[PDB]
Amino acid sequence: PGAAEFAALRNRWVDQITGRNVIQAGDPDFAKAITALNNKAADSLAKLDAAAGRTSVFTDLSLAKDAEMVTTYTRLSQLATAWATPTAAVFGDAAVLAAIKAGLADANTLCYNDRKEEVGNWWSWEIGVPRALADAMVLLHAELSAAERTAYCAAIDHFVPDPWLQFPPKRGKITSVGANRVDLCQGIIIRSLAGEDPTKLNHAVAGLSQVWQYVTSGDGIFRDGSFIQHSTTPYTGSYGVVLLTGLSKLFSLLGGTAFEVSDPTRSIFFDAVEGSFAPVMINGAMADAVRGRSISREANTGYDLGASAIEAILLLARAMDPATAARWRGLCAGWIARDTYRPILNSASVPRTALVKQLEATGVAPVAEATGHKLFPAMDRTMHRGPGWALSLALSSNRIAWYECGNGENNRGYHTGSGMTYFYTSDLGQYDDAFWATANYNRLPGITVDTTPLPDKVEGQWGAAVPADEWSGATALGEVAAVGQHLVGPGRTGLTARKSWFVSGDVTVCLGADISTASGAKVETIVDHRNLHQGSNTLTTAAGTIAGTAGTVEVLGDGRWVHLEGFGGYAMLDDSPLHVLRETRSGSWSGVNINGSATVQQRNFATLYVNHGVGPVAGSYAYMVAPGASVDLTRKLLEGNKYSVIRNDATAQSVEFKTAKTTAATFWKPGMAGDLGASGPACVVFSRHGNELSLAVSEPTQKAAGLTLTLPEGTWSSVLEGAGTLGTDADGRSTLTLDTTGLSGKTKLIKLKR
Ligand SMILES: CC(=O)N[C@@H]1[C@@H](O[C@@H]2OC(C(=O)O)=C[C@H](O)[C@H]2O)[C@H](O)[C@@H](CO)O[C@H]1O
Ligand code: NA
């Protein structure tokens, strides 16, 4: 293959990144996309350094700061995009083209060339500039000289001689993985189009294959659908999306050509759309629990990331078999239609507009998010849904870091892996509306927390430390899940807590036991810390209302349930005091991200919490959350033993859901919770239907060869469904012994006959 094929490939990439082939005559969304393109282009043009012998290309961007070097190149590729887009203000503009060509020439001369050593963030030299510079070569291919091509290719090959590797030589080069591998290969593949280099192209293409091979440790896609980047952080929602975006674009680019991605194992990547990406998408937004440090970004939010995921999945769908195509389109139509908070077409590029328009043209109906549980034990994350809500739990353990901070981002996020309970609801802005600028990072919802102030970046950057805890894990049987976390506090306070969650189809029961610390400070547990935006939502009790005055914390009393207007109900499952605070909070995104704006955002919060006090000895909590519940239903939560606590202490935690006829339990020690028993760390959910007992079990340390339960509900003589060896103990009770060797926290489902 040759010059004909290379021109065809370049043209297809220009088509893809401009949408020049798919702008619809008189369409108002295509019109607003062009206007956004125009404004960005004009902004950049306004900031050009017009000076003779200039030392920068843009007056607000220093070439001696690598992030602003990257920004210089992305402004240039944006301007070339606009120059290439029919009906853009600068389309085919000779003067604009001139300024682009000079910008790329001077950026090369002054800074980014084959004689330059990397300084600062390697990502800028090897991914930031190459992708942008490659796009600009290809966009401007009819206009750049052979000598210009040579110099910019040379610069690129200098920083990235092999996209299977990363880091400047002075550092020791390592295997690039995951999002990094994709971005590296992208810059080289696009560069290979500009330079017509089939050798670098084939090698870059070959290198996508490693990203979708399953892994059992470190970075990549796990069999349970977890995605980790940077070893210790659940990262489906941001690095996952960068991967997904890059592969969508490259697969589509190369499909049908001599360079087509032909590896059959890529079906693992296709399976990940529903196995990894869809469960953590909530009405358009990637879950905060899976997007690591990006929560600190005012303008790279859950919706930004979920919209990018939508674009990519729509792009990929074009190439799939008919059933899979339609399913993925149905999922996307759903995430689009339910999102009236950040509609995808607001600020969409021309290509994203085209894919969303295309989707709408198929008429494919929106698929709803399925109720129930999706567990990701490899990354300490679980998802739970019912009518009106999606709960996302965020854990940490000897495998998963408390948090990632880096590059001045998320330095305060050290409690975000302390058992957070994100309840996503029709309040689509709950976590997006300056929540991470204004929230109390020491009372994040759900967490147990030692009130010792911690320094920014405590435990270090880049998730380099993990809590040395006993286990975190989960299992589920039908409508009921069991999740548990041994919380070890960050910042060496010696905080320790045993947190468990038992999630049905509507209610979530939260139990805590065995809470102590070495620090001498008070320890709290946060029933909720809910963004009210500018609202004065009522907090309704048996007595009447509580916490009417902002800033004056009040203590519930003996009705034991509280209802928050527009959210749902909360209810105490013990006689602990409930502290309720209405507060007004302020902060700027500059306060949580070194790139954040200084604008001060001000938000009202409801904060609900238990105080375990100074020096708790076996401190404990017991409460439940009922998202979407009316006052009538909230009042009734505690009536009729509907949620019947069985055990809550340092050995076991367990509840029975009276109506679901299902019992759930976590086990920290050899022991019994009512008539269920276990011989070692376990999550279990069981239900008897007549003469049959269904159980779901996991071995949550991920290290034990086996596990023995002591069966509830009488004796059991045969196994109807699944693995395990029956038996009788010393006391005439039935046992089930499992081989849990290598299960990696996964659930085993079993059925037994009396
Ligand atoms: C996933 C992540 O945090 N990556 C960082 C970069 O962020 C991303 O920008 C892109 C992209 O440029 O293709 C995709 C995402 O929307 C966004 O998260 C970030 O710009 C660089 C800055 O050095 O660091 C990466 O680690
Ligand atoms: Na890490």
Rounded to the nearest angstrom, the distance between the alpha carbon of 590 and the centre of ligand 2 is 24
Tokens 């009130």 sit on residue: 451
Q: Which ligand is nearest to the CA of 402?
A: 2
Our answer to whether residue 230 is catalytic in this structure is yes
Handedness of CA 526, 528, 533, 534 (dihedral sign): negative
The burial class, CB within 10 Å (0-12 / 13-18 / 19+), for 723 is exposed
Whether 396 and 349 share a structural domain: no
User: How far is 655 from 481, CA to CA, in rounded Å?
Assistant: 11
**Those residues with Cβ within 8 angstroms of residue 531's Cβ, 6 or more apart along the chain or in another chain:** 427, 429, 430, 431, 433, 434, 435, 438, 439, 603, 604, 605
**Those residues with Cβ within 8 angstroms of residue 658's Cβ, 6 or more apart along the chain or in another chain:** 640, 641, 642, 643, 644
Ligand 1 nearest atom to the CA of residue 229, by list position: 1
User: How far is 728 from 99, CA to CA, in rounded Å?
Assistant: 83
Strands (E), 573-639: 579-588, 600-613, 619-627
Our answer to whether residue 498 is catalytic in this structure is no
DSSP 75-119: HHHHHHHHHTSTT-TTTT-HHHHHHHHHHHHHHHHHTSSTTPPP-
| Ligand 1 pocket, mutate which of 184, 300, 352, 410 (most atoms under 8 A from CB) | 300
Whether 437 and 515 share a structural domain: yes
Three-class SS state of 752: strand
User: How far is 335 from 424, CA to CA, in rounded Å?
Assistant: 14
Spell out the alpha helix ranges (H) of 265-393.
Answer: 267-272, 302-317, 322-337, 350-362
Residue 410, CA atoms < 13 Å, CB-side half-sphere: 25
Residue nearest to atom 10 of ligand 1 (CA): 242
DSSP 648-696: ESSSEEEEEETTTTEEEEEESSSEEETTEEESSSEEEEEEEETTEEEEE
Phi, psi of 307 (to 5 degrees): -65, -40
242 lines ligand 1 (CB under 6 A): yes
Whether 608 and 670 share a structural domain: no
Whether 327 and 413 share a structural domain: no
Whether 703 and 605 share a structural domain: no
Whether 361 and 383 share a structural domain: no
Q: Are 656 and 507 in contact (CB under 8 A)?
A: no
Rounded to the nearest angstrom, the distance between the alpha carbon of 242 and the centre of ligand 1 is 8
The count of structural domains within the chain is 3
The burial class, CB within 10 Å (0-12 / 13-18 / 19+), for 248 is buried
CATH number at residue 626: 2.70.98.10
Q: Which ligand is nearest to the CA of 294?
A: 1
The burial class, CB within 10 Å (0-12 / 13-18 / 19+), for 711 is buried
Alpha carbon distance, N-terminus to C-terminus of the chain: 69
One of 230, 384, 603, 647 is an active-site residue; which one? 230
Whether 574 and 698 share a structural domain: no
Among the candidates 609, 640, 671, a domain finishes at 640
Phi, psi of 718 (to 5 degrees): -145, 150
Among the candidates 604, 624, 640, a domain finishes at 640
392: closest CA among 412, 410, 417, 429?
417
Whether 440 and 469 share a structural domain: yes
DSSP 281-292: EETTEE-GGGSG
Q: Which ligand is nearest to the CA of 306?
A: 1
Whether 314 and 276 share a structural domain: yes
Among the candidates 338, 369, 400, a domain finishes at 369
Q: How many residues does the chain have?
A: 754
Whether 415 and 324 share a structural domain: no
- Per-residue b/e over 4-24, b at no fewer than 16 CB within 10 Å? eebeebbebbbebbbbbebbe
Phi, psi of 727 (to 5 degrees): 175, 175
Three-class SS state of 735: strand
294 lines ligand 1 (CB under 6 A): yes
CATH number at residue 243: 1.50.10.100
123 lines ligand 1 (CB under 6 A): yes
The burial class, CB within 10 Å (0-12 / 13-18 / 19+), for 726 is middle
User: How far is 529 from 532, CA to CA, in rounded Å?
Assistant: 9
312 lines ligand 1 (CB under 6 A): no
CATH number at residue 664: 2.60.220.10
User: How far is 245 from 129, CA to CA, in rounded Å?
Assistant: 18
User: How far is 33 from 571, CA to CA, in rounded Å?
Assistant: 48
Q: Residue 95: which domain range?
A: 1-369
User: How far is 650 from 575, CA to CA, in rounded Å?
Assistant: 19
Whether 167 and 210 share a structural domain: yes
Rounded to the nearest angstrom, the distance between the alpha carbon of 294 and the centre of ligand 1 is 9
The burial class, CB within 10 Å (0-12 / 13-18 / 19+), for 363 is exposed
Whether 389 and 403 share a structural domain: yes
Question: Do the strands 539-540 and 561-564 form a parallel or antiparallel pair, or are they unpaired?
Answer: antiparallel
Ligand 1 nearest atom to the CA of residue 293, by list position: 3
